[PDB]
Structures are given as structure tokens and as C-alpha cells.
RNA sequence: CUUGAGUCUCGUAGAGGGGGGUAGAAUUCCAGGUGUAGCGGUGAAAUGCGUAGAGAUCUGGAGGAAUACCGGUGGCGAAGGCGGCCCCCUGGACGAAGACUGACGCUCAGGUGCGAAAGCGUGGGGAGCAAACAGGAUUAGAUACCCUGGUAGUCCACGCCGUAAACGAUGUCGACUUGGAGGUUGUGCCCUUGAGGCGUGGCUUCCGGAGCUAACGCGUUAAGUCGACCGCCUGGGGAGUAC
């Protein structure tokens, strides 16, 4: 998944970020491991659970502020 | 592993390269940098790594 | 003035491209990269429906070769 | 779901002459022609449980709808019961 | 002290004590714990848990902490006609208005207790939980919506609480 | 009746089978009194991936009414038809018959991104150059 | 009577169910072409496989499950349950306008009907993965741990007792209780201008008052106030067995 779409003006590091967009995930990211059919929809799907520790952090920036241990 | 197969094939009397990646490997760019070091413009990194349609089930591993 | 109703950029800050529809093949390069392939819906935001009508529509359009499938295909 | 010209013939023979849908008679008039529709598909699928529930409900509450005609008119009931040939 | 009720001298009714030590880190602890409840004969919500090194100044804190920020309760000194069916943290009570003539049994410190409370006519056996911290609970959540009438008027007497809130 | 919105692609070279078969189609669809609301056939095109090989195809958009018992019968038709390489066929929910939301596209095609070549001249006698037996 | 509930055509959202049709891609395989020595496995390792030319690679064919992403705090099903894409057949649910009947109600012992998964009889089918079975490795031994081969299974069709961690670890469906805001949808109204606002339903989720709790926690989708009626529990081990 360096990705075949080519970084403008050629050199030898393929510019891996700018390229992908979907690939690896769930197909080629559980790897040597067994494969099931329903158990990515609880596994895999914790897109909202991993966004509000994030907030959170983002808030206590503030807060420490408010506090004034700052 | 690159700079072993690309000294040995300039007695086919090869001169440029172009190349082809497939896998999520080691060596993503560290294979590209030593046929780049053979004295190759390696222009084309054409990613052709084949995602099937979700293929055969690879194994399991350990027991728990 | 009333009644003005969907101009531009009202209801909505990103306009809805499609539900279902995949004949036209404009409206299915609408969220879809220069690899050739679908944008997480977290990073566009993007309404549900629109996209869960589009995840079907896409998967139609491919296996038409309307679009690739697999990176191979590019 | 039922064909929009077998309801509008079922509400011209059953209930009252008023062409409602609503009384007890033309309800299990429309009931069962859904149920008959229903067994249609029943004609095959025979492994297709999750739409027998369905069958169940609709079957259910025409018992019932037959229990309130013949606690209210006998004359309606006798009628309806021998003009839609229900049970045996 | 603050809100506390015409209360006189003290009460210093000493339900336990206890002494508690985790040990794990620079030999065991020292201090004790004291449970204490300060009353008035005339019905109080006084009960006060504190601790301290030695008991003296144990029971000086838990006694402090048993008479500030405590509400009046208004019984007439024996008699009650109002309680609640008691419940705190599990431990569970369920006094009923009832004649001073039949006498008290209570086991333990507790019929001691409740003779100070006001409360000891209108009690029953306990139920739920029947750890000494929370068995005593029959004069707090028991009396917490309340009244004691004397009046010849006790038929008016909801009626004259609506026409205040008029 | 109710609207089934089919579209399918052609082997350039395999086009030329294509003008008997598909007024024996239309026959069948009217046949049941439903109807042809457009009939657009639109011109070769890039395939992203070869189906029955070669990158190239030539799209038609049919624009069907018939009833349900009858396209079940076509939709395997259209499918397992040799000329076709590959078919599809969209709900009744949502669907236009009128003010085409390829029509654009369509003459963009013919305008400008076929080949201009004799592989897809074979393409335009089975393209909009259509040719059926009347009915 | 409507204040409970029921029903007609219409719109709307969705992975509810049964049977049909269909494509490409890696492992895998075969054939030809090209080509030489490891390939595999791991914590490190050896068993396996290979010079009959492996491994990989070009071209073309073969075959069977599967179909990632889109897939999201989404949506759906009676609970567990549901995800390639399409059609045939059809349920259940969400709204909305015209219109009807008018307690036709609630719950549910017994009851008929219905499987996550594997177990399972025959036919069809097999590419990969795998209990056993062999052999390697681990170590005070090693059936556990860790590796390589490898079969029934997995896959379909019909058929046999529906097991369970069968979920809200939360009974059914109904009434009431300060709310805001997120996700997202029917529809009235908005320079619709901020997945936005307001009017009114819809599922869905964070936050917290009244109340309830041992504690976490629940809180207008309750774990509150309750409603009817039902299921179920009454110390542990020994027993989901004995009878």
C-alpha cells in the first residue's frame, strides 16, 4: 500500500501519505490471524470511543488554566 | 536482498529499471534505495499490490 | 425574502451528490480519490443516508468497471 | 400490501354499502385478502420463517375481530364467517 | 451551634468505637474512630462520625460534626404521629404511632438510645443491615417528614398547612 | 407498471449481434404492455478493469418498464448474453424515465471520447445508429 | 363516546426473511515461457516442502468460500439475530394527508411457530483455514505453551432434538417526570447559508436535576413514579447431575 499514483516530480521515496485513503484497513490489517464474518461491527468500529478522550484532552488544556497550576 | 539481484543480472546486459511493489512488508522503501544504489532511475514505484475481494482466511496462530 | 429554498450552501455546508444513482459517473467521483476509491465518511462529513445508499451504488459501479476495485486496477 | 383494484372491490362487497374500510366486516375482508396474498408467496419459501411471523399477527387479530362480531351482531357474523369460507 | 435545636447541656451518647490501620507503609496507624450521637430529649437529626491519634480528641471532633448544620425536629418529648418508613444505606426501619403505656425492648445500648431520641413508643424491630453503624438510623430518616399534634384541631390540620402554601 | 432502469456494456468487436437481439427484447417487454420511456445508448468507453478482457465498452442504457414476472426473465438474459460482458439493473424507488442524468455524458462520448476507429465504428450500427424490425 | 386499540390507499429509511442471477483479485493449481537454491517458521528453533528445478515472475486457463473499504455515536430483525452486487416473492417498522370502526383492551400457565455457532444424515462441493492424527519445539517434565504437515468441518440444498455469555448480563406492553445538546431521518417554515435554527413525529447518544442504589450505575429510550398480569430466586460444596 505504497499506492501506484506517482509524488509530482519522481524520486526514489514514494510519498505514501498523500496517496491512500482506504486501503489496509480490515483486509489486509488483521493479519495471520483467523477471519470472521460479524465481529469487525463491535471489534474494529470504535471511531466514537477513540474521539472523546481526544476532547477531553483538549478541555483539561483550559482547565489546568482555570485551576491556575499554569 | 536488492543490491544482491541487481549486481548479478548486468551480464543480461540490462541498463534502466522500472519497479513494482506488492505487500504491507519490511523494505517499503529500503528495497527501492538499493536498486536505486545499482545505478537505476527508479522512476515508477507502480504500488500493484493485490487486495482481493477479502481472499482465504490465513491462519490462525497461537491456540488462545 | 421567503421561500428562497436551496440556493447554495444552505441546508448543510456540503452539498448531498447522489444517493443511489451510479449511471451518471460524475456523481460517484464526487467522494472518490485520485487512487480511485471512497474517503472515510468521519473525515468529510457527510450525512448517513447519502452515504449508505452511495455504499451500495459504489459497489454496483465497480463490478461494472465503471470503477477499480483494487489497487491493481489503477 | 394488497393491489389497489382487488381493495376497492373488496370494500364494494364487504362491510357496509358506504365503501369504508374501518367496520369489523370489511376489516377481516381486507385481512384475509392479505393473508391469501401472503400464502401466495407460501405457494414456495417454505423456509422463509421471519415473514410467517408476520402471517401470525395478522391471523392473530382477525380472532379477535371475529370474538367483537360475535359478541355484538350474530346475523353479520354468520354471514361473514361462511361468505370469506373460513375453517372447516 | 449554628441551626441546632435549644439543646442545653450536652449529650454525649458514645455508640462505639474502632480503631483501623492499613500497616503498609511505615508501621501501623495509630488513631482511633469514634461514632457519636448528640440529641436533646425533644427530638434531633444530631449524629456526628469523626476520628482523631487518641480518643480524647476522637470523640471531640465525631461530637462537633454531631451538632452543626442539624435541623430542628419538633416532637413533643414522648409522643409522635408522623414517621417514615425508615431506610438508610440498606438498614431499614418502620416505626408506627403508638401508645408510652405498653413499654420498650430494645437490645444492646439501644433502648438507651431511643429513650434520649423521643422515638421509643413508635419503634419496631430493625431489618436489613444489623451493623452498629447504621442500626441507630430509627430517629434520622424515621422522623425526616414529621408532626406531633396536640390539638384539638388534628382533622383541620393538613388543611392549615394548604392555606399557608395559599 | 413498475420502472427497472438497466444498463449494460458490449464487446466492441461482438457489437455487430447486438441489432438482431435487441428488437426481439423490446418485443418481449411490449409484448407485456410495458414500455420503452428512452432507449440511450451512449458510446464506447474505458473499462477500469478488462471484463471478458479488452479495457473498452460500449454502454446502453435501456430504460425499461415490464412487469416484475417479466424482468426476472430478462435480467438473466441480459446477464448470461455472450455479446454483453457484464449487466446491472436498479430498484423502482427513486428512478427517473425522463431528464437523463447521463444525457451529457452521453453526447460527450460521441463528441469526443470514443476512438474514431473501425473497432468502434462496429459500435454505432448497435449505438444510437439503431436499427429494429417494427412492431 | 374516544381517551385505549384496530384499518384503507400514499410517501420514507434500512445489512429483516426465502429462491434466482453475476464479476474480478491474492493464496491455490496446471500448462507453456523465463530463471537458480533455498522456500517456510520463530522468542530462537527444528519438523514440512524443494534440484524430478522449488520459491518467485510473464501469459493464458482452472476452481471454491469470500467480497475488505463505503461500514458511521448509522439503520434493521421477535430476543440471540442481519453486510458483495442485482432481480423475483414478501414481512415489520417510521412519517403524512383524506377517511372509517369505536374498549374490538392488557398480560399470559398450557400452547403452536421460529438456531449465534458448531454437532448432524445423504447428494452436490473443496481454494484456503482447522479439532483429531503424525512429527517438530518448549522444560524439573510438557497432553497445556509454541511451530509445521493434515482430515471431518467451514460451503450449498433439504432434513434431526432448538444449545448458549439466547444482551439492556435489564419481563411484556402502556401512562407520567426541569432538560440541553450530539448522531441522523419523514415533513412545515428560514438570506434554508455553520451534518445549523424553529414546528412536529422517528430511531440513536453524551451530559446532568428530582428519585433510587451496597457500589458502580440508571435518569424522560430508568436502574425513577407507577400500571396490570406473568416468569424466576431463597446459604455454600456435591448437581444442570440423580429421579
Known amino acids: 500500500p505504497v499506492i501506484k499514483v506517482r509524488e509530482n516530480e519522481p524520486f526514489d521515496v514514494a510519498l505514501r501519505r498523500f496517496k491512500r485513503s482506504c486501503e489496509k484497513a480490515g483486509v489486509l490489517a488483521e493479519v495471520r490471524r483467523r477471519e470472521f464474518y460479524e465481529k469487525p461491527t463491535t471489534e474494529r468500529k470504535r471511531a466514537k470511543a477513540s474521539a472523546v478522550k481526544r476532547h477531553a484532552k483538549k478541555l483539561a488544556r483550559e482547565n489546568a488554566r482555570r485551576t491556575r497550576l499554569y | 536482498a536488492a543490491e544482491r539481484c541487481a549486481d548479478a543480472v548486468k551480464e543480461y546486459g540490462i541498463k534502466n529499471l522500472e519497479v513494482m511493489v506488492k505487500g504491507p512488508g519490511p523494505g517499503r522503501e529500503s528495497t527501492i534505495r538499493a536498486l536505486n544504489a545499482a545505478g537505476f532511475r527508479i522512476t515508477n514505484i507502480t504500488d500493484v499490490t493485490p487486495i482481493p475481494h477479502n481472499g482465504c482466511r490465513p491462519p490462525k496462530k497461537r491456540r488462545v | 425574502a421567503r421561500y428562497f429554498r436551496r440556493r447554495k450552501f444552505c441546508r448543510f455546508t456540503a452539498e448531498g451528490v447522489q444517493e443511489i444513482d451510479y449511471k451518471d459517473i460524475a456523481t460517484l467521483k464526487n467522494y472518490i480519490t485520485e487512487s480511485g476509491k471512497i474517503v472515510p465518511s468521519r473525515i468529510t462529513g457527510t450525512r448517513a443516508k447519502y452515504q449508505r445508499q452511495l455504499a451500495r451504488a459504489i459497489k454496483r459501479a465497480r463490478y461494472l468497471s465503471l470503477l477499480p476495485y483494487t489497487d491493481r486496477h489503477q | ?88 | 451551634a449554628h441551626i441546632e435545636k435549644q439543646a442545653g447541656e450536652l449529650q454525649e451518647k458514645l455508640i462505639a468505637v474502632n480503631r483501623v490501620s492499613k500497616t503498609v507503609k511505615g508501621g501501623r496507624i495509630f488513631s482511633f474512630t469514634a461514632l457519636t450521637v448528640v440529641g436533646d430529649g425533644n427530638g434531633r437529626v444530631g449524629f456526628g462520625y469523626g476520628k482523631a491519634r487518641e480518643v480524647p480528641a476522637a470523640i471531640q471532633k465525631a461530637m462537633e460534626k454531631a451538632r452543626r448544620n442539624m435541623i430542628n425536629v419538633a416532637l413533643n418529648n414522648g409522643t409522635l404521629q408522623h414517621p417514615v418508613k425508615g431506610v438508610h444505606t440498606g438498614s431499614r426501619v418502620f416505626m408506627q404511632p403508638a401508645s408510652e403505656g405498653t413499654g420498650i425492648i430494645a437490645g444492646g445500648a439501644m433502648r438507651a438510645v431511643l429513650e434520649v431520641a423521643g422515638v421509643h413508643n413508635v419503634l419496631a424491630k430493625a431489618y436489613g443491615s444489623t451493623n452498629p453503624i447504621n442500626v441507630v438510623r430509627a430517629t434520622i430518616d424515621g422522623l425526616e417528614n414529621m408532626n406531633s399534634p396536640e390539638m384539638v384541631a388534628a382533622k383541620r390540620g393538613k388543611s392549615v398547612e394548604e392555606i399557608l402554601g395559599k | 407498471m413498475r420502472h427497472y432502469e438497466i444498463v449494460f456494456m458490449v464487446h466492441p468487436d461482438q457489437s455487430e449481434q447486438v441489432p438482431g437481439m435487441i428488437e426481439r427484447y423490446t418485443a418481449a417487454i411490449t409484448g407485456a404492455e410495458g414500455k420503452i420511456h428512452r432507449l440511450e445508448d451512449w458510446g464506447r468507453r474505458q473499462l477500469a478493469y478488462p471484463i471478458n478482457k479488452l479495457h473498452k465498452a460500449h454502454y446502453v442504457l435501456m430504460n425499461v418498464e415490464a412487469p416484475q414476472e417479466v424482468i426476472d426473465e430478462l435480467e438473466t438474459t441480459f446477464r448470461f448474453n455472450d455479446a454483453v460482458i457484464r449487466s446491472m439493473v436498479m430498484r423502482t424507488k427513486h428512478a427517473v424515465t425522463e431528464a437523463s442524468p447521463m444525457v451529457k455524458a452521453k453526447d460527450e462520448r460521441r463528441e469526443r471520447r470514443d476512438d474514431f476507429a473501425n473497432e468502434t465504428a462496429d459500435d454505432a450500427e448497435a449505438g444510437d445508429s439503431e436499427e429494429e424490425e417494427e412492431e
Open chain 4, 1 to 88: 400490501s394488497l393491489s389497489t383494484e382487488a381493495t376497492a372491490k373488496i370494500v364494494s362487497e364487504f362491510g357496509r354499502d358506504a365503501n369504508d374500510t374501518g367496520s369489523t366486516e370489511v376489516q377481516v375482508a381486507l385481512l384475509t385478502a392479505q393473508i391469501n396474498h401472503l400464502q401466495g408467496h407460501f405457494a414456495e419459501h417454505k423456509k422463509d420463517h421471519h415473514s410467517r411471523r408476520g402471517l401470525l399477527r395478522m391471523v392473530s387479530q382477525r380472532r379477535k375481530l371475529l370474538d367483537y362480531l360475535k359478541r355484538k351482531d350474530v346475523a353479520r357474523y354468520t354471514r361473514l364467517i361462511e361468505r370469506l369460507g373460513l375453517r372447516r
